[PDB]
Design an enzyme around this catalytic site. Sequence first.
Site, PDB file in Angstrom:
ATOM      1  N   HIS A  64       3.974 -15.395  -0.095  1.00 38.21           N
ATOM      2  CA  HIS A  64       3.428 -15.240   1.256  1.00 38.21           C
ATOM      3  C   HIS A  64       3.886 -13.912   1.878  1.00 38.21           C
ATOM      4  O   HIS A  64       4.499 -13.852   2.950  1.00 38.21           O
ATOM      5  CB  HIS A  64       3.798 -16.445   2.109  1.00 38.21           C
ATOM      6  N   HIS A  68      -0.153 -10.421  -0.330  1.00 36.31           N
ATOM      7  CA  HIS A  68      -1.098 -11.526  -0.185  1.00 36.31           C
ATOM      8  C   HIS A  68      -2.036 -11.288   0.991  1.00 36.31           C
ATOM      9  O   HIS A  68      -3.242 -11.486   0.859  1.00 36.31           O
ATOM     10  CB  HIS A  68      -0.359 -12.868  -0.038  1.00 36.31           C
ATOM     11  N   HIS A 102      -2.482 -13.120   9.032  1.00 36.60           N
ATOM     12  CA  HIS A 102      -2.478 -14.580   9.121  1.00 36.60           C
ATOM     13  C   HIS A 102      -1.249 -15.253   8.504  1.00 36.60           C
ATOM     14  O   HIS A 102      -1.085 -16.469   8.655  1.00 36.60           O
ATOM     15  CB  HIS A 102      -3.701 -15.127   8.416  1.00 36.60           C
ATOM     16  N   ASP A 103      -0.423 -14.531   7.773  1.00 43.90           N
ATOM     17  CA  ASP A 103       0.810 -15.089   7.239  1.00 43.90           C
ATOM     18  C   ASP A 103       2.021 -14.272   7.688  1.00 43.90           C
ATOM     19  O   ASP A 103       3.036 -14.223   6.990  1.00 43.90           O
ATOM     20  CB  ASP A 103       0.749 -15.178   5.714  1.00 43.90           C
ATOM     21  N   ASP A 213      -8.134 -17.154   1.888  1.00 41.34           N
ATOM     22  CA  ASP A 213      -6.737 -17.539   1.739  1.00 41.34           C
ATOM     23  C   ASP A 213      -6.388 -17.960   0.309  1.00 41.34           C
ATOM     24  O   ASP A 213      -5.295 -17.653  -0.186  1.00 41.34           O
ATOM     25  CB  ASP A 213      -6.458 -18.670   2.725  1.00 41.34           C
ATOM     26  N   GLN A 265      -2.842 -27.695 -11.338  1.00 36.96           N
ATOM     27  CA  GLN A 265      -3.845 -26.684 -11.064  1.00 36.96           C
ATOM     28  C   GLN A 265      -5.198 -27.354 -11.002  1.00 36.96           C
ATOM     29  O   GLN A 265      -5.798 -27.441  -9.927  1.00 36.96           O
ATOM     30  CB  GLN A 265      -3.871 -25.589 -12.129  1.00 36.96           C
TER      31      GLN A 265
HETATM   32  C1  LIG Z   1       3.061 -30.683 -10.753  1.00 37.69           C
HETATM   33  C2  LIG Z   1       2.005 -30.266  -9.763  1.00 37.69           C
HETATM   34  C3  LIG Z   1       1.492 -31.181  -8.841  1.00 37.69           C
HETATM   35  C4  LIG Z   1       0.545 -30.818  -7.904  1.00 37.69           C
HETATM   36  C5  LIG Z   1       0.106 -29.507  -7.905  1.00 37.69           C
HETATM   37  C6  LIG Z   1       0.586 -28.571  -8.807  1.00 37.69           C
HETATM   38  C7  LIG Z   1       1.539 -28.959  -9.738  1.00 37.69           C
HETATM   39  N1  LIG Z   1       0.005 -27.330  -8.575  1.00 37.69           N
HETATM   40  C8  LIG Z   1      -0.787 -27.516  -7.544  1.00 37.69           C
HETATM   41  C9  LIG Z   1      -1.492 -26.428  -6.813  1.00 37.69           C
HETATM   42  C10 LIG Z   1      -0.517 -25.446  -6.219  1.00 37.69           C
HETATM   43  C11 LIG Z   1      -1.192 -24.417  -5.371  1.00 37.69           C
HETATM   44  C12 LIG Z   1      -1.054 -24.331  -4.050  1.00 37.69           C
HETATM   45  O1  LIG Z   1      -1.628 -23.397  -3.253  1.00 37.69           O
HETATM   46  C13 LIG Z   1      -2.448 -22.460  -3.839  1.00 37.69           C
HETATM   47  C14 LIG Z   1      -3.007 -21.522  -2.998  1.00 37.69           C
HETATM   48  C15 LIG Z   1      -3.882 -20.589  -3.532  1.00 37.69           C
HETATM   49  C16 LIG Z   1      -4.193 -20.606  -4.881  1.00 37.69           C
HETATM   50  C17 LIG Z   1      -3.613 -21.541  -5.723  1.00 37.69           C
HETATM   51  C18 LIG Z   1      -2.713 -22.469  -5.206  1.00 37.69           C
HETATM   52  C19 LIG Z   1      -2.060 -23.449  -6.068  1.00 37.69           C
HETATM   53  O2  LIG Z   1      -2.189 -23.433  -7.280  1.00 37.69           O
HETATM   54  N2  LIG Z   1      -0.807 -28.817  -7.114  1.00 37.69           N
HETATM   55  C20 LIG Z   1      -1.720 -29.432  -6.187  1.00 37.69           C
HETATM   56  C21 LIG Z   1      -1.676 -29.099  -4.842  1.00 37.69           C
HETATM   57  C22 LIG Z   1      -2.622 -29.622  -3.980  1.00 37.69           C
HETATM   58  C23 LIG Z   1      -3.607 -30.472  -4.452  1.00 37.69           C
HETATM   59  C24 LIG Z   1      -3.634 -30.824  -5.783  1.00 37.69           C
HETATM   60  C25 LIG Z   1      -2.692 -30.313  -6.658  1.00 37.69           C
HETATM   61 MG   LIG Z   2      -0.076 -19.554   5.032  1.00 35.95          MG
HETATM   62 ZN   LIG Z   3      -2.007 -17.387   3.170  1.00 33.56          ZN
END
Ligand SMILES: Cc1ccc2c(c1)nc(CCc1coc3ccccc3c1=O)n2-c1ccccc1
Ligand SMILES: [Mg+2]
Ligand SMILES: [Zn+2]
Length: 308
Positions: A64, A68, A102-103, A213, A265
């Site tokens: 962040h 970004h 925004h961040d 974002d 993911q």
């Molecule tokens: C073990 C595990 C359990 C859940 C995970 C995980 C791993 N990885 C994730 C997602 C983490 C993530 C968060 O914010 C982002 C923002 C922009 C682009 C990508 C991301 C991103 O990959 N999640 C996830 C987060 C939200 C909804 C569903 C899955």
């Molecule tokens: Mg943010």
């Molecule tokens: Zn952001």
Amino acid sequence: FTLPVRLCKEIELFHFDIGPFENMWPGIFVYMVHRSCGTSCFELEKLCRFIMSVKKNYRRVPYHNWKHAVTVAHCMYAILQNNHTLFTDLERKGLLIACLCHDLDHRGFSNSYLQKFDHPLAALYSTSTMEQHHFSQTVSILQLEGHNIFSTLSSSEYEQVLEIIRKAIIATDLALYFGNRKQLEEMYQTGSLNLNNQSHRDRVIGLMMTACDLCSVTKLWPVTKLTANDIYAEFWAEGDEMKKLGIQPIPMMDRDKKDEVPQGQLGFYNAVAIPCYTTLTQILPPTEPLLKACRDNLSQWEKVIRGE
Ligand SMILES: Cc1ccc2c(c1)nc(CCc1coc3ccccc3c1=O)n2-c1ccccc1
Ligand SMILES: [Mg+2]
Ligand SMILES: [Zn+2]
């Protein structure tokens, strides 16, 4: 500073990666500003002081960070350019500043962290904690001497631009995306969405903030992979500190389960990312390369799960 011409047409690509050009990112934003709004939309004097003070007010957190904000700002630039017809000068001015900002002053830490352990900012702001603060920072720097880039606006046109930025910054709280993307999905498939309606513009803009974002999922797979390291480096630190007390962080912030990342993911793509760009593309058909690049990466992560 002038952008090395071997870009120009590369900046206009949705999937454009700003990474390798760090010494240039201040000049790219100016560039993206200059191209879009015209040159003299600010005094080049006070846009640089503004840009550089936004900059310096990003922390050395793994994700962040300065890099970004420029990545989100760039993505608003690409969305705007491909939708030239249907936003206003006052919108295409605020939305790029709003994306760069925004961040602002992020701490590598969730809103859920800042409340589950009496953090003073969540004492200030009880909902959208970090996002009400990012806007707070934005206003401060704006008012700093020789930094009001919106000095050349009438009274009711200045408080307009401030509103757009505030709304756009708040919409980047992913917890409000889910309701907003679902409200947007009802109207378009009832037929009732009216871009003249101001409150619909706000939803549309909100989603465009959401799409920008999360736009490292819309890059070329090698870039999208490396960004993920930065996102987890930071989640793992927030989990590490939830661990220090004796509390087991959600498996997303538990470094002791990197194994689970490619599955998380895919589920994140299937639950957040694909629906968002899917909706944005129905409202804004030109933004379809974002959806296309999101699918491509999703199948990449599926191969990572499936041993390929
Ligand atoms: C073990 C595990 C359990 C859940 C995970 C995980 C791993 N990885 C994730 C997602 C983490 C993530 C968060 O914010 C982002 C923002 C922009 C682009 C990508 C991301 C991103 O990959 N999640 C996830 C987060 C939200 C909804 C569903 C899955
Ligand atoms: Mg943010
Ligand atoms: Zn952001």
